[PDB]
Design a protein around this ligand. Sequence first.
Ligand SMILES: Nc1ncnc2c1ncn2[C@@H]1O[C@H](CSCC[C@H](N)C(=O)O)[C@@H](O)[C@H]1O
Ligand SMILES: Nc1ncnc2c1ncn2[C@@H]1O[C@H](CSCC[C@H](N)C(=O)O)[C@@H](O)[C@H]1O
Lengths: 230, 230
Amino acid sequence: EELLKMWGEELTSEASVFEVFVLYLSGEPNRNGHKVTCLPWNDEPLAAETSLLKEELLRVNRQGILTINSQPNINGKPSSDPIVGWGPSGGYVFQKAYLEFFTSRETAEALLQVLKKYELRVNYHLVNVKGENITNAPELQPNAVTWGIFPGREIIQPTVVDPVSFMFWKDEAFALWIEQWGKLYEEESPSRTIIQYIHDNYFLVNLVDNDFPLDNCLWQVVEDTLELLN
Amino acid sequence: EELLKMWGEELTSEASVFEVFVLYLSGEPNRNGHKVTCLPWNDEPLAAETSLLKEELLRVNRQGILTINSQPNINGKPSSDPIVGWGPSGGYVFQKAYLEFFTSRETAEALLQVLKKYELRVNYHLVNVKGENITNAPELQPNAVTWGIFPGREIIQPTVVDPVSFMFWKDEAFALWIEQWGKLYEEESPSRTIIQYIHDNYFLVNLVDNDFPLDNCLWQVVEDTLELLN
Ligand SMILES: Nc1ncnc2c1ncn2[C@@H]1O[C@H](CSCC[C@H](N)C(=O)O)[C@@H](O)[C@H]1O
Ligand SMILES: Nc1ncnc2c1ncn2[C@@H]1O[C@H](CSCC[C@H](N)C(=O)O)[C@@H](O)[C@H]1O
């Protein structure tokens, strides 16, 4: 009853879903006065590194690019930074920019068309519930996205985007629609209709911008998809 | 006969050894008109990254800090750079500054005294033929000194300074004096005296500055040792 109170008692349209993600990312309550304190993929409030890319995420989600995971790029910041720092003291820490999101088939086709402009810079991975796995991943090999350099030590790379492990995550990612939000609504409801439509027709998408020394391209990539579509 | 022609037919003093290293590092011939084209540890001309730190090495060796291996610090330069670049195209490549050298016991004690000022920033390792291994190495663990970040890929760290492997290199490093320069001179020669003295009384020393984003400290560390000594 508390989940169904924050995610809306009944969805009017896709817009309702778009708002549930925008109200998770902003601090604002819905029209009923309740904050979206979690989503099926998160169960938590955001980690503090998202403070670096909040407005951007607001803008992206307001369009229907439904982000479920993210990362700022970090260019060798002090390992003591309370926002991004980790590991032993006196080192440096690094990140690639990363974005994980669901999309409509229409927006997925517009994104595949725009990713031709960014092919070598951005690793991408689109998939849907029937398969149709599309990725530019080198030989289906991991991509490092977080690492740290520490005094007297080897490099530590704690975090990766593996195209093989993503295909096990896919099975959670799409089933968390029906199993935790669909089964929350009535069987025959237009709400269930909406959620079953999103369970079937949407693409899960992952992007990684490999140029961590530069400004993040992923926001311009999505602006370029909304240009092409609009 | 060709080695003994370039390393000098007979050493007057330690100064003679100091000059053989300075004439390896500069392009200049000795007083006899012959270039030092190699040393016992190298068998080759320098790699092009030394162009970035030549004058510095000239200055260091002119004092008796006999460098046998070195590296500039590199802060995420294009992986396509003909000087420093390596691996797949479109990535970034990184280095810590590194210096490997022999020293007199007097200069080794002056360096141990000055390394107290740089303790956390500079990894150091001194050793001599009897043992007397001194290092600040974390739990006797490797230190990364070269690495690269490439699109779609994990980090590659091709090059390390391992405090355990250094103790196998030690046995070459000191024996290459007697086995390739000492046995080049006569048995009873003052030249053999000189080389046996350097085979026994000198310390092999390795330093690594871990702050690759900053200007290299190692040159000021050696200036600080020549201040203390002088
Ligand atoms: N709905 C959502 N949209 C965008 N980002 C989200 C999100 N829910 C969680 N996140 C973010 O996803 C990230 C998980 S942590 C990612 C790993 C970490 N940056 C590393 O350094 O290895 C956090 O920043 C979290 O705030
Ligand atoms: N006598 C000497 N003094 C100082 N440096 C030397 C030297 N003889 C060789 N070198 C240097 O030692 C280095 C060996 S290559 C070191 C590894 C490489 N920089 C990496 O990126 O992993 C070369 O730069 C070479 O020019």
